[PDB]
Design a protein around this nucleic acid. Sequence first.
RNA 1: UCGCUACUACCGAUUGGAUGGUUUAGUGAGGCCCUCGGAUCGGCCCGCCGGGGUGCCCUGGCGGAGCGCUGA
RNA 2: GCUGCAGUUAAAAAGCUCGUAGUUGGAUCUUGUGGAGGGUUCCCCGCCCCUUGCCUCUCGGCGCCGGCCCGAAGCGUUUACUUUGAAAAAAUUAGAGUGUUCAAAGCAGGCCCGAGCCGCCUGGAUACCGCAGCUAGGAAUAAUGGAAUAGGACCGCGGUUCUAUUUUGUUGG
RNA 3: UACCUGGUUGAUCCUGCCAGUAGCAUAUGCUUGUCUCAAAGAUUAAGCCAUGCAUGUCUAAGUACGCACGGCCGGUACAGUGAAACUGCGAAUGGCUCAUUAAAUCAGUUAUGGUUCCUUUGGUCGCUACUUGGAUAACUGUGGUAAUUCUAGAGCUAAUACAUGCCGACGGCGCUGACUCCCUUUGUGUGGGAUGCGUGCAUUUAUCAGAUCAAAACCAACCCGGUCGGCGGCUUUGGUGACUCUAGAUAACCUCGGGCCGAUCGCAGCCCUCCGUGGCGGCGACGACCCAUUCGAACGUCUGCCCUAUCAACUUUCGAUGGUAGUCGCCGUGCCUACCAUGGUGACCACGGGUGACGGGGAAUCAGGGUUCGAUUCCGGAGAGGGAGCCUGAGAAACGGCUACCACAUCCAAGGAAGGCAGCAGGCGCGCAAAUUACCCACUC
Lengths: 65, 206, 263, 158
Amino acid sequence: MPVARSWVCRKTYVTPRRPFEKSRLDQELKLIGEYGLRNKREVWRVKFTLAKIRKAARELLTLDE
Amino acid sequence: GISRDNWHKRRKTGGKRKPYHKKRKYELGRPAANTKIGPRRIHTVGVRGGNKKYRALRLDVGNFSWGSECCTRKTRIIDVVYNASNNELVRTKTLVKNCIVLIDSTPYRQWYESHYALPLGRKKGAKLTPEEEEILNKKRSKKIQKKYDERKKNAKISSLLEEQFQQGKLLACIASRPGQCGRADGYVLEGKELEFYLRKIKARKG
Amino acid sequence: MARGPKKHLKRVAAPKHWMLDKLTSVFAPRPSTGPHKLRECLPLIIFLRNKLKYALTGDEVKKICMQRFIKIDGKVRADITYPAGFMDVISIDKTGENFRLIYDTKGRFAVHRITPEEAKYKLCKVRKIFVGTKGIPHLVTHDARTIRYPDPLIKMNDTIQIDLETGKITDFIKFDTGNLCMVTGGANLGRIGVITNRERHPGSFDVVHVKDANGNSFATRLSNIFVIGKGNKPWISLPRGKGIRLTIAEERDKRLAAKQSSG
Amino acid sequence: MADIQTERAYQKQPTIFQNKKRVLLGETGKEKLPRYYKNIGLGFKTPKEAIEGTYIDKKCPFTGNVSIRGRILSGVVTKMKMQRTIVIRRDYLHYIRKYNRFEKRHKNMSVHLSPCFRDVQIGDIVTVGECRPLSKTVRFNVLKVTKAAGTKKQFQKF
RNA sequence: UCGCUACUACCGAUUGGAUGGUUUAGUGAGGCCCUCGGAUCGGCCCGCCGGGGUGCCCUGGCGGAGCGCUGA
RNA sequence: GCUGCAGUUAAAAAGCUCGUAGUUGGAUCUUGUGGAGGGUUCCCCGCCCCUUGCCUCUCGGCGCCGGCCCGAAGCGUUUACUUUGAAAAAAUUAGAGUGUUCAAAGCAGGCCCGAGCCGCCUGGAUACCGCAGCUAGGAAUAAUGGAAUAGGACCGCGGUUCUAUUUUGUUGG
RNA sequence: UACCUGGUUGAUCCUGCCAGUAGCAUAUGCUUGUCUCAAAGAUUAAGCCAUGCAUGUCUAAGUACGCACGGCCGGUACAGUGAAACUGCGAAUGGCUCAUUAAAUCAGUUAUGGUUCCUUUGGUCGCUACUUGGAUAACUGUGGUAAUUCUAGAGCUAAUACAUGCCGACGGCGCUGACUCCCUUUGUGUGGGAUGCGUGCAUUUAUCAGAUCAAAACCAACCCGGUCGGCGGCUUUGGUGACUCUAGAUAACCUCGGGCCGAUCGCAGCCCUCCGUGGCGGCGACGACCCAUUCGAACGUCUGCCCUAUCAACUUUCGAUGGUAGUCGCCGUGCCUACCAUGGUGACCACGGGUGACGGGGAAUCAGGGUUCGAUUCCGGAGAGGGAGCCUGAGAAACGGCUACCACAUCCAAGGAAGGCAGCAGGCGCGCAAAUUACCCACUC
Ligand SMILES: [Mg+2]
Ligand SMILES: [Mg+2]
Ligand SMILES: [Mg+2]
Ligand SMILES: [Mg+2]
Ligand SMILES: [Mg+2]
Ligand SMILES: [Mg+2]
Ligand SMILES: [Mg+2]
Ligand SMILES: [Mg+2]
Ligand SMILES: [Mg+2]
Ligand SMILES: [Mg+2]
Ligand SMILES: [Mg+2]
Ligand SMILES: [Mg+2]
Ligand SMILES: [Mg+2]
Ligand SMILES: [Mg+2]
Ligand SMILES: [Mg+2]
Ligand SMILES: [Mg+2]
Ligand SMILES: [Mg+2]
Ligand SMILES: [Mg+2]
Ligand SMILES: [Mg+2]
Ligand SMILES: [Mg+2]
Ligand SMILES: [Mg+2]
Ligand SMILES: [Mg+2]
Ligand SMILES: [Mg+2]
Ligand SMILES: [Mg+2]
Ligand SMILES: [Mg+2]
Ligand SMILES: [Mg+2]
Ligand SMILES: [Mg+2]
Ligand SMILES: [Mg+2]
Ligand SMILES: [Mg+2]
Ligand SMILES: [Mg+2]
Ligand SMILES: [Mg+2]
Ligand SMILES: [Mg+2]
Ligand SMILES: [Mg+2]
Ligand SMILES: [Mg+2]
Ligand SMILES: [Mg+2]
Ligand SMILES: [Mg+2]
Ligand SMILES: [Mg+2]
Ligand SMILES: [Mg+2]
Ligand SMILES: [Mg+2]
Ligand SMILES: [Mg+2]
Ligand SMILES: [Mg+2]
Ligand SMILES: [Mg+2]
Ligand SMILES: [Mg+2]
Ligand SMILES: [Mg+2]
Ligand SMILES: [Mg+2]
Ligand SMILES: [Mg+2]
Ligand SMILES: [Mg+2]
Ligand SMILES: [Mg+2]
Ligand SMILES: [Mg+2]
Ligand SMILES: [Mg+2]
Ligand SMILES: [Mg+2]
Ligand SMILES: [Mg+2]
Ligand SMILES: [Mg+2]
Ligand SMILES: [Mg+2]
Ligand SMILES: [Mg+2]
Ligand SMILES: [Mg+2]
Ligand SMILES: [Mg+2]
Ligand SMILES: [Mg+2]
């Protein structure tokens, strides 16, 4: 049981709630085609990082200057 | 074996508690000593940390003290008279702390007559002719006024104590645990303690 | 499960100011019994192989110590888990260098080379003053040392400077408001200042205030104060920074503006 | 208190000695019996009924062999039916976090009341100190009795 | 309501069974403690010899007696 | 369903009333300005009575021309509340630095010399850690209390009664 | 990202659920090119276990007559490497699992002024002696049994094993009081004193003191400023909030076989009213009574717990709550005994029952609040098939220790002997459900 290993890891993306939404589908395909990406996981990744940056910014923005 | 743990008791509400572990060793037994009177034997128990501990059986000599005089001597223990805890501890002559014992009273007489140059309770004087008046009425012109007349005035042993010295025994209380040390020490009763214990003894037996 | 004393220490449970990794292995040095407590000490193997890089494994520090090179407080220690602690003196005469274990500013020991003339005495905090048989006064210091016949005007919490070769208390500083001090426990582990106050709560944990050399004030318990000077004048040499505790913002400003990257 | 010898052994304070002395140092007014007492510290004052009066309580804080250290609590007296032992109740509020609201709770303590205090009756306020285990369910000792509230000991003319 | 198929639970002679958990009373292995016990093993005390001294003594060895005291 | 649900007819208010615990509980007990931080009144020092404040003396360091005086000792009936300090393992979580080739990770790493430096610089931060216990400011809100058959107060005295054990040099009547 | 969609009707508006939607973790189906990281017999059976391994250990410094080698010649503490065996230490750590356990464990908080502590570091070491005794291993030799890490008889020999026991340096004070010296005979105002007894720390009991307050007046006796009846003038370890604390004085006690005060081993050296011994000189190792420190352990304080009333009263000579004296214990304590009192808990949920309950740090989800999980690598607890009892030891109620009963099960020559994988691999069984009978001490310790 005791071992010199590390188990720290995380996911880097999140799937969308509405699975079949024509607008989301075609907007993410426009974005895949114009930047020559392989997957949509590669769009959900960037969406995740942008969402976390926004969360941190809004969190800092509610404190008093 | 025997255990001193708290977890076999009911809790304050009167509810049972269930055990979580088997009996440990820091919760031990080691049955009682029950010191009798007789020729000395002392066993030795090995306890937590090493630290041998002497368990007495059949003690017959103690180290008792007279607190008014500040005079302590080795003496023989003759019998047990009173015991505040139980009464079967006087029927079996078992000797525990705060017991009431008779002692031999002789070395205190010796020290007293030597220190004060004055007798104890004595009935008649013929034995004092070859010896003892030799100690008590020592043939010396120096000291025998100046020293022993300052010993006098103080030499006023109370009624009960001087009545004790006639039958040749005293009344003493043990102030040490013979089951843990192997020694039976104590102090001879005086004053209100003596009156209380004498009345209790007289009231119990007979 | 646990019928006696333990002898292993897990790497995750070791003190944090040792500044260890988490991938070398499951185990930590586990300092052996000594004059300093387990959570407040610094073993020899960690000081030699981790902070000084003289050794690279445990075998190398073992065979460095087995040559009578390392001296802690004058005497030659051969153990590699000896608990060296506060205000100690390390001496390696094969290279001619002496150190002194003192918390720097951030709650960890520093590497604080000192002059060989300063590596002769050490300051010690008095914890106990009792009388032995025949009425002989004794001392007990923060590193288990016992001194017989001290002058009968040194009391608890006072500091005594002792010669490392002979014991033999040399001088002493008194616990009073106005005396330099370094905090050796708690949250302000390393900061240096003057006393200026001592609050008293009979029955528990009399607290003491401190105010450093920039007008900042902070309190601690009396159990963590260590008088190291008469006032505005240390008796031992102070490390770089001098227990000032510049905040993270000033830290960033000084690290950026100075552009401390390399030479 | 004329006779404090009620058990089958002679009750007397330790560290007190009945010494050798002359006739008529007193036949009444000096009965040759001093009183051992100590001060508890922490600002608590030893009551005069422990210095003057006579009684044998080895578990009393002021004259017996016991040391007060640790916590100091307080409560109100609820029962006086044991010998030198009373039962006091401590009420408090427990804050639940789901709701933002408190709830009333109470604890009972068996505590030791020295014969030094003779004015106590149900309803007083009592301060306690922490001692070594004095029995199976007793660890505290009464240091001070107070009653300075409404419906006082009697009509307020003090 | 009566009738057909299928599924579920219930009452119940059987004085059912299995596994247990407490439990009156009776017995009770083994360890520990106490009071005894005494298979055996030594030492001390007396002759002959070897070694030392003044017919005797001291270490030792031999066979032994008194096996008397005695220790484990 | 605390924030946050429902009970005429969809599921739902006991037939009705009394009542101990539990939960909840009406109104009421000191105000302007001199200087000073933020405006042109208003929100740390003090004046209409008080505005840390009454004191009682005492020993320690502090004024001044043997004498003169304030800080030091109690503390403001208490609590809850609120703000602040102390003391609470690491790992994980949030978070600072760092181009693992990027990332998940990790605690590292960065420079200059032809090697002729037998080296130098620098990090391994910080936050959070409820409730209970410790600590010091605030006094709105909510609790609790004071003299109605009185006693607060001043060296007010009067009487009886106990006594501490210091000096009168010491030891004692 | 603080979100909704289909379904009762001929159609409408609602309540309300069923279904859809996204994550998370166990299993399973189909399919699988590269590379980094890495969970893995917890769920059910804390069911049963074939085989191998997982705990041993020597420096110059405890004992070397193995010819086991081996030297320049032999043993004159005797060469040197050194098997075996005695001795010392460790084996109470680590590893594994979660059956028990519901104010119990555990967490934060405090207390030992109520206890023990191998070792580490620092203090302490003087009230035949130029060195004592006998007796066991290994080794040699004879054996017994179907059988084991079985062991008996015979012959030798050591200690830092076992067991004894001085030497020095006391020039050590108090209590005793033969006697002895001036003037007051004496008492007392004076001064020597043989003689004897006890005389270190640690144990046990008893006792004593534990010092400094505010001033004066007479009387009996005394110091000094000085005088042959009286006036001014000294009072003395340490610490805590608090001890019956620490230290001091007195009288004894000793437990020996059952406290201490060194009959131990290794490196390298100097002066001799002087010819090897009279002498003395350093550096270590080991051991050891006591105190403190460190590492802890144990027992206590305050607060905090899932469901249940188809659990409302519970507890009590088979101690329940308290009081006094004791036994026992490392110590406080109904811990246990004797004698007394009649108490203690509860609607603020006591007491009883259930848990597919080990607690916590933590994990998943999450607008704000919350809900569910935590067998599992760090901390704490508990157990080694089920109960129970002990030895050694500083530390164990130890199972890689011992002794019994119960349940299983192995060998037998039937007399007897031997056992405990919830350690690492592996195997059977159980199941929907979980890996190699591999290599190495190179890293961490
Ligand atoms: Mg258990
Ligand atoms: Mg010991
Ligand atoms: Mg363990
Ligand atoms: Mg170690
Ligand atoms: Mg059917
Ligand atoms: Mg039965
Ligand atoms: Mg029986
Ligand atoms: Mg038996
Ligand atoms: Mg609804
Ligand atoms: Mg209807
Ligand atoms: Mg309806
Ligand atoms: Mg109605
Ligand atoms: Mg109101
Ligand atoms: Mg992180
Ligand atoms: Mg990162
Ligand atoms: Mg808090
Ligand atoms: Mg406050
Ligand atoms: Mg319909
Ligand atoms: Mg339709
Ligand atoms: Mg659904
Ligand atoms: Mg490739
Ligand atoms: Mg299992
Ligand atoms: Mg095997
Ligand atoms: Mg060898
Ligand atoms: Mg060792
Ligand atoms: Mg061992
Ligand atoms: Mg496993
Ligand atoms: Mg239960
Ligand atoms: Mg609790
Ligand atoms: Mg805890
Ligand atoms: Mg706790
Ligand atoms: Mg030492
Ligand atoms: Mg033999
Ligand atoms: Mg009792
Ligand atoms: Mg008792
Ligand atoms: Mg009742
Ligand atoms: Mg219950
Ligand atoms: Mg239950
Ligand atoms: Mg379970
Ligand atoms: Mg749980
Ligand atoms: Mg939330
Ligand atoms: Mg767990
Ligand atoms: Mg389970
Ligand atoms: Mg596992
Ligand atoms: Mg714990
Ligand atoms: Mg166990
Ligand atoms: Mg099993
Ligand atoms: Mg041992
Ligand atoms: Mg066992
Ligand atoms: Mg084990
Ligand atoms: Mg075995
Ligand atoms: Mg096993
Ligand atoms: Mg296995
Ligand atoms: Mg492993
Ligand atoms: Mg299968
Ligand atoms: Mg699987
Ligand atoms: Mg399978
Ligand atoms: Mg290794």
